[PDB]
């Protein structure tokens, strides 16, 4: 049958903490296979399945650096979203980014996802064409404009149609 | 394979 790979990256800014809680959870076919937890000590990406015990040390080093850098992106953009929605600092807010790919039996892409949600409500999302954006509201429109101008859809589509589909194929070979 | 550090800000 068909198959999916899906990552869910979340940042929640906290009240008297200020350093946000960052998490990343990868799934294939809706089973958790990797996780990063910023509230861990010296936090790294860690396999959650036996069939991820053979990616080799530099995969884990590389995506652990990505998490650290992605944490900088969630925290900058949480505080941009404060401005865009005219709320105040030392709030509790959540940014969620869901992305990945569905493939059919043949391993070819059926569907791609890039969805952003602020405080449980969706903010901007990539349409099935992988070429245009749906903005929820007036704040999201600002973002949609900047991203149409900068060709962000093409940028995400290169991941969606290349790396995502190729890695979902390898993960399905690893874990028969 | 997670995504790369996001190219663009909101």
């Amino acid at each position, epitope marked *: 049958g068909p198959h999916s790979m899906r990552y869910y990256e979340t940042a929640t800014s906290r009240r008297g903490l200020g350093e946000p809680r960052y998490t990343s959870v990868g799934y294939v076919d809706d089973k958790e296979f990797v996780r990063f937890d910023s509230d861990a000590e010296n936090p790294r990406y860690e396999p959650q399945v036996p069939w991820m015990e053979q990616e080799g040390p530099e995969y884990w080093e*590389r*995506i652990t*650096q*990505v998490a650290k*850098g992605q944490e900088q992106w969630f925290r*900058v953009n949480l505080r941009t979203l404060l401005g865009y929605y005219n709320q105040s600092a030392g709030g509790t807010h959540t940014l969620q980014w869901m992305y990945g790919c569905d493939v059919g039996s043949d391993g070819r892409l059926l569907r791609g996802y890039e969805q952003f949600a602020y405080d449980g409500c969706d903010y901007i999302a990539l349409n099935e064409d992988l070429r245009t954006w749906t903005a929820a509201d007036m704040a999201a429109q600002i973002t949609r404009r*900047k991203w149409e*101008q*900068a060709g962000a859809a*093409e*940028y995400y589509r*290169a*991941y969606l*149609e*290349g*790396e995502c589909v190729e890695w979902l194929h390898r993960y399905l070979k690893n874990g028969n | 394979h*997670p*995504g*790369s*550090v*996001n*190219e*663009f*800000d909101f």
Partner: T-cell receptor
Amino acid sequence: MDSVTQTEGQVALSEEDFLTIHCNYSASGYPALFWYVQYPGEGPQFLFRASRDKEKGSSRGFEATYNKETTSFHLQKASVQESDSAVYYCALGDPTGANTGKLTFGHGTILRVHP
Amino acid sequence: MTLLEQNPRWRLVPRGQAVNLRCILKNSQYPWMSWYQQDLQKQLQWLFTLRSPGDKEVKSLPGADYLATRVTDTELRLQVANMSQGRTLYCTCSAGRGGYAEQFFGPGTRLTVLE
């Protein structure tokens, strides 16, 4: 380690000649690849990008195809003009996924087109 | 029209002496700002990409040591110290971190070193 190699320092052609400038890189992952051109007395400027295997970038009659199998991005033009005279730089986008901003530039290739 | 201003345009620098460079962003569409050197062999090397006011970074390459500072949303500084070999410094800007969005090169600061 990560690298970009342009096989040529200098290339001399007549107008309407066939041009190829070789670019080979070493990077794992899914880096974007680029060409930049520096016309004489000016600063470097973007020519085109390719972000995926087998994608052809093009501008101003020049093209290059992303070839992951040969880690190639060879710049070509069928018919050069005197106004193509310049230095062409191949660049590797950051491939680690850390997106630090670093472009890695080959040594440059000087193209002199003679009338 | 013009995206970036650089000062100074040029500067004669006694060996060992320090020089202050400034770069002004004319358009906030392109808020990511970088420094690149071009040495006298025409090699381009990335020095820094700095986004936030307050980001301060430090690097040492053959011929010059550097302190780069993102001062405001529109101002990038570079201190070039212990200069032993001439180079040009280009500010650049981008709508992106720079793994994907192209760099727009400003007009450049040419530093000449004489014993």
